[PDB]
Structure formats: structure tokens, C-alpha cells
From a paper:
Human 3-phosphoglycerate dehydrogenase ([name]) is responsible for the NAD+-dependent conversion of 3-phosphoglycerate (3-PG) to phosphohydroxypyruvate (PHP), which is the first step in the de novo serine synthesis pathway. Thus, [name] activity diverts glycolytic flux into biomass production. Limited proteolysis with thermolysin revealed a stable fragment of [name] consisting of the core of the catalytic domain containing the cofactor-binding site, and this was shown to crystallise readily. Thus [name]-93 provides a valuable tool to investigate binders to the cofactor-binding site.
[name]-93 was then successfully crystallised with an empty, accessible cofactor-binding pocket. Soaking of all 15 fragments into [name]-93 crystals was performed overnight at RT using a fragment concentration of 80 mM in 20 % DMSO. Difference electron density corresponding to seven fragments (3, 5, 9, 10, 14-16, 47 % of tested compounds) was clearly visible. All of the fragments for which crystallographic data were obtained bound to the adenine-pocket suggesting this pocket to be a preferential site for fragment binding. Analysis of the fragments’ binding modes showed that four of the fragments (5, 14, 15 and 16) were coordinated by hydrogen and/or halogen bonds, whereas the other three fragments (3, 9 and 10) appeared to be stabilised only by apolar contacts. Of the four compounds forming specific interactions with the protein, fragments 5 (3-chloro-4-fluorobenzamide), 14 (5-fluoro-2-methylbenzoic acid) and 15 (N-(3-chloro-4-methoxyphenyl)acetamide) constitute substituted benzene rings. Fragment 14 was substantially less potent (Kd = 26 ± 31 mM) compared to the two structurally similar fragments 5 and 15 (5, Kd = 1.6 ± 0.2 mM and 15, Kd = 2.8 ± 1.6 mM). However, fragment 14 still formed a hydrogen bond with the side-chain of Asp174 and a water molecule present in the binding pocket.
Author numbering:
A (entry chain B), B (entry chain A): 100 to 294
Write the structure that this text describes.
């Protein structure tokens, strides 16, 4: 609420980091390397962003990424489609969303219906090379399914602010070259902190 | 032109990386650490972005960063103030720009007038803790001045895609904890490459 914008901002940063591998490029440069072919990236403009969860945060993400020319679709069980259309988000059933997306970001509570919202079954319906962001709650993206999708290249990259366990005790996800991460910084700004 | 949007998108990513230290946070996570106090960040919304150079790329950057609620000011010796106002950028003389900016981004050619555009003189007029982005041409930002401003905290962070010498032979800048960098990736997307 108070911290809606901090969260939305971090999310949009993670989307741009996934498109251009800025974290990985900075580590490469700090190691004295100059690796230009390795960090060939993609443009956001024209790409499709799926926003799962269309409350305050998800709406803030949408309007920000619309300015980059991304197409914004999404799903929220409770938000009427008229409301989501007011902020430029086409609502579709989940089953319609998966194959359309270049990027998927989650802005849901952690409930049994959203634990593993992204899992092996939903990864398999995604377009090959989908990129995912979770700056919401640890466990929305099933971490084992995610590593499997990174290993096969079904998922081309992920950005995680949150983990099923914090700090994350299992490191294969975090240490993967196509994964960028933060220690649950979503609400960690001076402005969110100080009202 | 062809690569205007690739450049503009990398620039907006660098600004978001500066605000939230995403590259530094990922490195901290990849080193097995969980450092939440260290990576306190700031919100973009309400902050001022100075844009030096108001051609295609600078204009693209402006409209994208306007969606985050940043105030966009800037300077371009050619563009009239009524025109730049038409894409939401308030023109002011440089001397006016320096004290007002939370972030400064450069989108100029490399000419005698722009080499060391940011230097010890211009850093001293900036607000304490300014963050700077160069994704245009190496040398617009004087590198020795930049390191001095990072060491003193006059500059709170910088993001560099380009260097006076490439690859950069001198590492005190690149290795600084508040500096994020890439190996001149500005035009490096599949879409810019392939017309
Ligand atoms: C409950 C729920 C299920 C599926 C989904 F995609 C989103 C939500 C939400 O809580 O916003
Ligand atoms: C020539 C020039 C000088 C100062 C500056 F801020 C911008 C430019 C530009 O070429 O856009």
C-alpha cells in the first residue's frame, strides 16, 4: 500500500535485468572480463507480459511496463475484467495466458491455490524461453519446477526476491547463471520504511 | 534508430539497478550471503531525472521513466523548450540542472563540448548522493572525476555501459561497490541486430 510502489518498482527492475543480464554482466566486468556475445539480450518492446494478480502492485507494474511497449495480459479471480481493462490489462483464463507470455510476473497471496502456481504442469504450457519474476511470496513458483525449467531451457531466466525458505538453504537455483536474486528487498526503500 | 529502443531500454534498466542495487544483491546471494540492511534502496517515484541530450534515445528514456513518476528535466542545445515540453521534459540550463537531480543520464555525442561533461566542477554542483548513468559514449563522464565523487559520496552510484578505453584497462572504477557495468551492451539485442 504504503509499499506498493517499492514492490512494483523492484519487479520492473527485475524484468529489465532478465532482458539484459545486467547483474551477470556486472559480475563479469568486476572479474576483469569483457564478454559481449555472452550477454546478447532482448528488447521488451512488443513482448508479452503476463501479470498474475491484478491488485495494486500488479496494476502498477502493468502501467510501467506498458510504457516500454509490452502487451499486458493477466488473471485475477476477483478483479472484474472491466477494472483490469481500465488499466490496460486483458484478462484471460490461466490456460490462455501460459502460451502467450515472454515474461510472467506473480503478484498474489500465498494460498493453497497459488502455491506452485508455476509448476511443471504450467511450465510445460509456457512458450519456450519464458522468463519469470517472483517479487511477491516465496512458494508461488515451485522452486524444483523452476530449476527443471532452467535446466531444459523451457525457462530462459528467473528473478527471485523471495524463497520458499529464507535464507534459501538449497543453492542450485540461486547459483544458476540465468537466475538473479535479492534478499527480499521488495519493501526495502527509505520511502516505504518512513511514512 | 534501428537501435534506439535497445539503448533506451538498457539505460532504464541501469537506472532501476542503481535505485535498488540489484547487481550487488545478486552477487551477495551468489556468495552465500543474506544482507538485507546493506541493500536499502530508493523509490524512483517523485525523484528527478536529468537527461542530457534530448534526441531519439533521450526522449525514449524520458517517456519510460515518466511512467515511474520521475520528474524529467534536461538540456539539449538544439531542441526548443516548447518541443521538449511536448514530451514531458523541462528544459533548463545546465547550471540549473545539476542541483536538482537525483539521477543523471547522458545521451549525447562525444564532442569536445561533451567530453568530461560530468567532471569535478559539475559533480560539485550536484546534490549530494547523485546517481549517474552513461550508456552513450565513453568519456562523456570523466572517469577520474567519477571515482573521486564515488569515494567522497558526492556520487552514491554509477552505471557504465561505455568506457574511455574498451576494455577498460583501469579497474578502480569498475570494481567500486557502488558501480554497475556492462561491456557496451547498449545495441546488443536480437531485434537491434536483425532488421
Ligand atoms: C487466488 C489466485 C489464484 C490464481 C491466480 F493467478 C491469482 C490469484 C490471486 O490471489 O490473485
Ligand atoms: C552538445 C551538447 C552539450 C551539452 C549537452 F548537455 C548536450 C549536448 C548534446 O549534443 O545533446
Amino acid at each position: 500500500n504504503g509499499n506498493s510502489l517499492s514492490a512494483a518498482e523492484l519487479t520492473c527492475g527485475m524484468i529489465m535485468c532478465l532482458a539484459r543480464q545486467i547483474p551477470q554482466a556486472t559480475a563479469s566486468m568486476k572479474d576483469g572480463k569483457w564478454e559481449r556475445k555472452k550477454f546478447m539480450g532482448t528488447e521488451l518492446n512488443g513482448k508479452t507480459l503476463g501479470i498474475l494478480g491484478l491488485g495494486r502492485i500488479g496494476r502498477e507494474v502493468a502501467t510501467r511496463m506498458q510504457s516500454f511497449g509490452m502487451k499486458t495480459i493477466g488473471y485475477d479471480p476477483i478483479i472484474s475484467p472491466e477494472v483490469s481493462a481500465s488499466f490496460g490489462v486483458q484478462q484471460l483464463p490461466l490456460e490462455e495466458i501460459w502460451p502467450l507470455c515472454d515474461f510472467i510476473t506473480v503478484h498474489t497471496p500465498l494460498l493453497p491455490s497459488t502455491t506452485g502456481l508455476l509448476n511443471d504442469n504450467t511450465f510445460a504450457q509456457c512458450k519456450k524461453g519464458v522468463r519469470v519474476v517472483n517479487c511477491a511470496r516465496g512458494g508461488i513458483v515451485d522452486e524444483g519446477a523452476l530449476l527443471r525449467a532452467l535446466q531444459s531451457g523451457q525457462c530462459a531466466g528467473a528473478a527471485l526476491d523471495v524463497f520458499t525458505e529464507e535464507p534459501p538453504r538449497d543453492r542450485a537455483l540461486v547459483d544458476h547463471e540465468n537466475v538473479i536474486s535479492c534478499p527480499h528487498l521488495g519493501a526495502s526503500t527509505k520511502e516505504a520504511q518512513s511514512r
